[PDB]
Amino acid sequence: LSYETTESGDTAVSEDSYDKYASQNTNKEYVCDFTDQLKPTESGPKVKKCEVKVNEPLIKVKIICPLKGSVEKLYDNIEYVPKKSPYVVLTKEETKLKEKLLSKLIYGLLISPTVNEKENNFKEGVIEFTLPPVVHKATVFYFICDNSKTEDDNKKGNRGIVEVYVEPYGGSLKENLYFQGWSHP
């Protein structure tokens, strides 16, 4: 009866004024921190887009989302999709973000189940995954932290999205005696 379900959806408000941001890259750790950036300030929601760009091996990606009731009155209607992040990510096919699995999407990808003694999930605020040494095809996937239904003092929150764009990296098959095969990972 209980089962894993798939879902669709990109936005709930007008767009094309996305306000892109790059991720904060601390030398191998790429971070999208939404703690102060989604608090309700302007009347009406403002979509904010963090952009992670990966063209090198073993990049850790950390995404921080504030919790429901983490601070009083500011996150009473926060939502995060997908719920099983980072095991489930959002991918765009028909301009709708449909739920797909990250281990099918990049082959050989490993997800630690505990980020820092707490569960690797948005229930604990922060998700975190490390990309493998070789990715063979370019891949884009998405996460959403929607505070745009929270309203305090007649001001609505923000819809933050994370776009992880992985370029192909890892080099050619030959002249890589370590990742080639016949004895290897």
Partner 1 sequence: EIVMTQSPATLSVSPGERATLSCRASQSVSSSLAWYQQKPGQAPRLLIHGASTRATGIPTRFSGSGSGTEFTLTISSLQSEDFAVYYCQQYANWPPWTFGQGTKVESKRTVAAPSVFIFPPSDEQLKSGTASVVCLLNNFYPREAKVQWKVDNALQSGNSQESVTEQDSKDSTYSLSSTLTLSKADYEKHKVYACEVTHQGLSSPVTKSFNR
Partner 2 sequence: DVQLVESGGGLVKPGGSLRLSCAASGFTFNSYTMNWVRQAPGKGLEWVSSISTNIRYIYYADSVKGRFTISRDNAKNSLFLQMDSLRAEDTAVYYCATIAGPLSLKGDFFFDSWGQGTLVTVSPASTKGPSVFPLAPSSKSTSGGTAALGCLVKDYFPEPVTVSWNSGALTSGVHTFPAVLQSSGLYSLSSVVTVPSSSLGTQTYICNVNHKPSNTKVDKKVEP
DSSP-assigned states of every residue in 63-119:
EE---TTSSTTTSTT-EEESTTTTTEEEEESSSSEEEEEHHHHSTT----SBSSSSB
> What CA–CA distance (Å, rounded) separates 182 from 125?
41
Binding to partner 1, residues 74-103 (CB under 8 A): 74
> What CA–CA distance (Å, rounded) separates 35 from 66?
5
Element (H or E) spanning 20, and its range?
Answer: strand 20-22
Among partner 1, partner 2, none, partner that 31 touches (CB below 5 to 8 angstroms by kind):
partner 2
Binding to partner 2, residues 9-48 (CB under 8 A): 19-25, 31-37, 48
Among partner 1, partner 2, none, partner that 22 touches (CB below 5 to 8 angstroms by kind):
partner 2
Per-residue interface string for the shown chain with partner 1, residues 7-36, x marking contact by CB under 8 A = ------------x---------------xx
Total site size for partner 2, rule CB under 8 A: 16
The residues binding partner 1 (CB under 8 A) are 19, 35-37, 39-42, 71, 74
